[PDB]
Symmetry: C5
C-alpha cells in the first residue's frame, strides 16, 4: 500500500559503516556491516500530536509501507535487522536498520602492492504506481566508527554520489545511488618479505660474474632461479587473473629474462673457454659485471615511470 | 489451484543478469545473481477498470496460483525474493523476482587456456491437470548489466534458445528452456606466469649442449626438470581431472619427454667420452644443439594445429 | 494421524537423479540433487470421482499425513521442496518432491586411481501405531538424466535393491532401502601427470650406472628422490588415510626402496674406487645396469597381479 | 508450563550414533549425526485408556511441555527434527528426535599418530520453578549403527557417564551428562607415507661416512636435510600448535640435530684433510659410521619408553 | 512499546563464555558461544503475588518489551536462543539467552609468537523516547567454563569495563560496554618447529668458513638460503600483512642480510685466491669465523631488547 504521491516520492538514503572486513583480492569482494538510513514522507500517518498519543508514534514494520531498497552489487541477499521506525507528527517516516552484506566490487591491480582502490556500494529502489528516487543525505553518510579496520588497508574516505542515476529496467523506473569507499594498500610488509628478498636472490644470482668455474655458476644461477619461481608462484597465488598488465608482474618477468640472459652468458663463457679463447671470455664477463646491474636499475626506472608517474 | 485452461498454459520467461562471479574451473560451477521474469494469463481474476479499483491490482504470492519454475542444473535449491506481482487488468499476471543460484554447467578444457565456454542455465516447469509450457521472450532475456564481471573472462553474449524442450518425466510433462552465457577466457597472465617461464626453463634445460662437463650437465637438465615438475603441479592443481587430452597437458608431457631424451643424450655423451671416443662425443651433442629446438618448434606446430585449427 | 491399516502400510519409493556432483575422496562423501517419489494408499481420502470435483485431487502438505522419510548416510539433514501431491479417486496418494543432500558413503582406494566404486544412498522410515514398509518401484528408480556429471567419474548404473531390510531400533520397527550408484574413476590424467613423470624421474634417477664419478651420482639420485617425495606427498594429500594397503601406496613405497638401494650402490662404488679396486667397482655397477630395471618391471607385475588379477 | 512435580523431575536421556565423520585434528572437532532419546513423567496427561483413544497418545511438540536439552561443547546451535512424541498411559512421555551437530572436544596429541582419544559430548538441562536432572538410559545409549565411519579412525566404545554433574549457573541449577566416544587412530598409512621415507633420507644423509669428498658430502647432508624440512613442515601443517611436547615433534627435532652434527662432522673432515692430517680424518669418519646409527637407535629406544611405557 | 520511565532505563548485562575457539590470526577474528544475561525493571507488569499466581511469572519474548541488544564488532548478526524470561513481582525482568557469534577484534603481532592479546567484545544498545544505559554486573561477567580452550592460547581473565561509553549516534544516544578476554600465546611449538631448525640451517650455512673450496661453499650458502626462504614463506603465509614492523619479520630480514654478506664473503675469497693472494683470503675468512657469530649474538641481543625490554 504505497503513499499516494502527486509526483515522485523521494527516499533518502544513507549508510553508516560499523564493521568493514575481509577484502578478498582474488574474489574482488569485501564485507560490510552497517546502518541503513531510509526516510520518506508518507503523509497518511500524520496524527496531530495534541489529539492523541505523544509527539512521535512508533510503528512496527508490518503496519507501514516501506520503500524496498535493494543493493546492486552483492553476492547474496543482504541480511538485515530492523532497528527503528518512527513516524513524525507531520507524517514523516524515519526507518533505520542494521544490515550486513558482502560487496562485490572491481579492483585495479595495475599498481599492486602500492595501489589505491575505490570500492563501490550501490542502492537501487524500484517503483510501482509511483516513482521512487533514492538520494543521499550527507548527515547519515558522515558515519563510520573511528575504529574501522579493513586489515592491510588504510581508509581514506566514505562518501555518496548524491545524484541518483535513473535506470528503466523491465518496464519500470529504478533509482540508483553510488556510495564510495576509498582505500590504499599497506605496502610495508611486502618490502622485507617479497621485494627486497627477491632483489637479494637476484643479486646473488649474477654474483657469478666474479668466478671462472662453470659448475659454481650454474649451481648459482639455477638455484636462484628456483627461488624466484617460488616467489613468482607465491605472489601469483594471492592475486586474481588480470586481463591487463601489472607492475610487480612486469618486474618479475623482467627478472625472469635477466636470469635467462645470465645463463646464456655463463654458458658462452664456458664454450669460449674450452675453445681456448679466454681473451674474449674474460671480456664478456667483465662487461656483464657492469651491464647486468645497469640494465636492471635502468629498466626499473623505465618501468617505474611508465606505471605510477604517467 | 491452477487456472482452468482450454489448452496448454503458456508461461513466458526472461532473465536479467545483474552480477556474475565465482566461475570455478575445478567445480565446473559458477554463481549467478539475476532477475527472473514470469508472465501468464490466469483469467479467473477479472477486473472492471471503471466499476472498481484502478488499472493494476497488486497481490501477494499467497493469494495467487504461481507456476512452479525450477532450475535444472543448480547445486542446492534456488534462493529467491519476490520483487513484484502486478495483475494486469484482463487477468494477466506480471511476476518478477530476484534470484541467486550457483549453476552447474560443463566446461571444455581442450583449448585451455584460450577457449570459449558456453554456460547453460536450464529452466523447467511441471504440469498437473493442465499442461504448462515455458517460453523465452528475447526482450527480457537480453538481460545483463553492462557492469557484469565474471573475473578473468570476456563476456560475449547472454541469450536463450527460443524453443522449449518438452520432457516426459514420471507420468507428467515438463518444459525445459536453455539460457546461454557465452564467454571466452582472458589469456594474458598465462604467458608471463606459466607459458614463457616454462619455455625459458626448457631452453635453459638444453643450454648444457655447449658444455663438455658431465656435472654441469646433470645440474642443468635435472634442476630445470624440477622447475618443470613444479609448473606441472601448479597448472595440474587448478584444473579438474580430464577424461580427454588437454592442449597444455599435451605440450607439458612433450616437454617431459624432451627432459627425458635430453638426459639420455648427456649420459650417452659421458660414457662415450670416457671410452675415449670424443670423435663421436662432440658429434652427437652438436646434432642435439639443432635437433632439440627444431623438434620442439615442430612438435608445437604439430600440436598447435592439431587442436585449434582442425 | 496415520491411516488405519488392517496390516502393514506400504510406501512405494523411487529416486530420479537430476544432478550428481562434488565427490570428495578425502571426505568419502558426494552430493546428490534428485526427485524423490513416494506413493501410498490412504483409503480415508477416497471420496470417489463422480460425486464432486474431478479425477485427481491435489492436496497441500499440511492437510495430509505424509510418511516421514529420512536419509541414513548423510552429513546434515536434506533440503527438500514438495513438487506435487495428487490423490487418486480410490485413495491413492502420489507424493513427489525434489531434494538436495550430501551423502556420506565409503570408498575403496586399493586399486586407486584405477578403482571402481559403488556409492550408497539409504532410505529409512519409522513406524507409529501402524507398521510401515518401504519398497522400490523400478519405474521411478530408473532415475537419471542423460546429463548427470559426477566430474572425473564414469557413471555405470543407478539401481535399487527391491528387498527392504527391517531393523528394530528403540522399541519400534524401521524399514531401510539401499539405492546404489555404480561409478568408475576416469584414470587418464594420472598418466601424463603423475604416473609417467614419476616413471621418467625414476629411470632418469638410475641413469647414473653409466658413470664413474661420485659427485654427479649423488646429485642424480638425490635430486630425483626430491621429486618422488613431491609426487608421493601430492598424491598422499588428496587421499584419505588408508587403514589398508593401496596399490599406488605400494608401488610408491617400492620406488622409495629402489631410491634407497641406489644410494647404497653408489656409496659402495666410490669407497671401492678409492680403495683402488675398480675391478669390483665397475662390476657391481655393470650388474646393476640390468638388474635394477629387471626388479622393477618384475615387482610391478608381482604387485599388479597381487592387487588386480587376484 | 512445566508439569507440577512434588520434587525434582528426572529426564531420561540416550544417544544413538548413526553417522560419525569429519574428525578435524586441527579443529579438535568432530561431527555426529544421531538419535536423542528423552522420557519423563508428566502426570497431568493421565491415562483413560478405555475411556477414549488407544494405549498410547501421540502429541506434536507444541502441545506438550518438553524439556529444553542443550549441548554443552558445540560450535553452533544444534540442528534437529522431531521424530516422535508418544505419551504413555501413565503420563510418561516418550520423546525421540534426530540431531546433527559438530562437537568441540579436546584431543591429546602426546602419542600422535598412535594415540587413543576420548571425545566428549555433554548434555545439560536448566531448571525453572521445578528442578530438572538428566540421567542416562542404557537402553537408548547402548548402541551406535554398525556402519558409523569416522574415516581414519577405529571406534572402540560409545558410552555415557551415568551420574549427572550438577552445576549452579546464574542462580539456577543445571544437570550435565558426559557421553564419551572412545576411539583410536588408524596408524598404518603413516609408515609408507611419512615415517619410513624420513628414516631413509636420514640414513642416506649419513651414508657420506663412506666417502672422502667434501662436495658430495655437503650435497648429501644438505639435500637430505631439505627433504626432512619438507616432511617436518608437512606434519606440522596438519596439526594444531601444542602447549606441550609431542613425540613426533620430538624425534623430528632430534633428526634436525643429527643433520646438524652431520654437517659439522663433514666440515671438520674437510678442514682437517686440507691440513694434511688424514690419520685423524679417517678415524673420525669411521667412528661416525657406527656412533650415528648407535646414538640414534639408542636415543629412539630412550624416547619410546618415556612416552608409551611410562 | 518501552516501559514508561521517569529517567534513563538501566539494563544490567552479563556474559558467560561457554566455548572459545577458532581464533584466526590472519583474519583477526575469533568465535564465541556464550550466555547473555539481561535484567531491567519494567514496572508496568505489577506484583499481585498473593492476589493470584506465584512469586514468578514467565513470559514469551513476544509479550514483553525487550531491549534490543546488539554487538558492535561482529561479522554477521549474532544467532541467539532465548533460554528464559522470568519477571519478578516488583517488575524486575530477568532475561537469559544463549548466543553464538563471531567477534572481530584487532591483534598485535609485534611480539609474535610470544605476544599476549586482549580480545574485545562490545555491547551497545540504542534508545527511543527513553534513554537506555547498559552496565556491567561483575557477578554475571565472571563467566567462562573452566573448560574453555582457545587452542594454542592460555586464557587469563574474562572481564568487563564497568563504565559504559555513551555515544551520541545519528540523533540518538547509544550505550557501549567493553568486555575483555585476556590471553597469552603458547609459544612452545615454535621452538622445535620454526625457531630451532632455522637457527640450525643458519649455522650450517656459514659452516663454509672452514672450507677453501668454492663449489662446496656456494652449495652450502645457497641450499641453506633456499630452505630459509621456505620458512619465511611458511610464516609470512600464516600471518596478516603488517603496517608496522614485527619482531619475527625483523630478525628474518636480518638473517637474509647475513646470508647476503656470507655469499659476498666466499665470493671475495675465490677471486682473491685466483689472484694468488690467499694470504689475504685466509685472514678474511678467519675474521668471519668469530665476527659472524659475534655480530649475530650481538645483533640478536640488540634487537630483542628493542621490542620486549623497553
Amino acid at each position: 500500500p504505497p503513499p499516494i504521491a502527486d509526483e515522485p516520492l523521494t527516499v533518502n538514503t544513507g549508510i553508516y559503516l560499523i564493521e568493514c572486513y575481509s577484502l578478498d583480492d582474488k574474489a574482488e569482494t569485501f564485507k560490510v556491516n552497517a546502518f541503513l538510513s531510509l526516510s520518506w514522507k508518507d503523509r497518511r500517518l500524520a496524527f496531530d500530536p495534541v489529539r492523541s498519543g505523544v509527539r512521535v508514534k512508533t510503528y512496527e514494520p508490518e503496519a507501514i509501507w516501506i520503500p524496498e531498497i535493494r543493493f546492486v552489487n552483492v553476492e547474496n541477499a543482504r541480511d538485515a535487522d530492523v532497528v527503528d521506525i518512527s513516524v513524525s507528527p507531520d507524517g514523516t517516516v524515519q526507518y533505520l536498520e542494521r544490515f550486513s552484506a558482502r560487496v562485490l566490487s572491481p579492483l585495479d591491480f595495475r599498481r599492486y602492492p602500492f595501489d589505491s582502490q575505490t570500492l563501490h556500494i550501490y542502492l537501487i529502489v524500484r517503483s510501482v504506481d509511483t516513482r521512487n528516487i533514492v538520494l543521499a543525505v550527507d548527515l547519515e553518510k558522515v558515519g563510520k566508527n573511528d575504529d574501522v579496520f579493513l586489515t592491510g588497508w588504510d581508509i581514506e574516505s566514505f562518501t555518496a554520489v548524491v545524484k541518483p542515476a535513473n535506470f528503466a529496467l523491465e518496464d519500470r523506473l529504478e533509482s540508483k545511488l553510488d556510495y564510495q569507499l576509498r582505500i590504499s594498500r599497506q605496502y610495508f610488509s611486502y618490502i622485507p618479505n617479497i621485494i627486497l628478498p627477491m632483489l637479494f636472490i637476484l643479486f646473488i644470482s649474477w654474483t657469478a660474474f666474479w668466478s671462472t668455474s662453470y659448475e659454481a655458476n650454474v649451481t648459482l644461477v639455477v638455484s636462484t632461479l628456483a627461488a624466484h619461481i617460488a616467489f613468482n608462484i607465491l605472489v601469483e597465488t594471492n592475486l586474481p587473473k588480470a586481463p591487463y598488465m601489472t607492475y610487480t608482474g612486469a618486474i618479475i618477468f623482467m627478472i625472469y629474462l635477466f636470469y635467462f640472459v645470465a645463463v646464456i652468458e655463463v654458458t658462452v663463457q664456458h664454450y669460449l673457454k674450452v675453445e681456448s679463447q679466454p681473451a674474449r671470455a674474460a671480456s664478456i664477463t667483465r662487461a656483464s659485471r657492469i651491464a647486468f646491474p645497469v640494465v636492471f636499475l635502468l629498466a626499473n626506472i623505465i618501468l617505474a615511470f611508465l606505471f605510477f608517474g604517467f
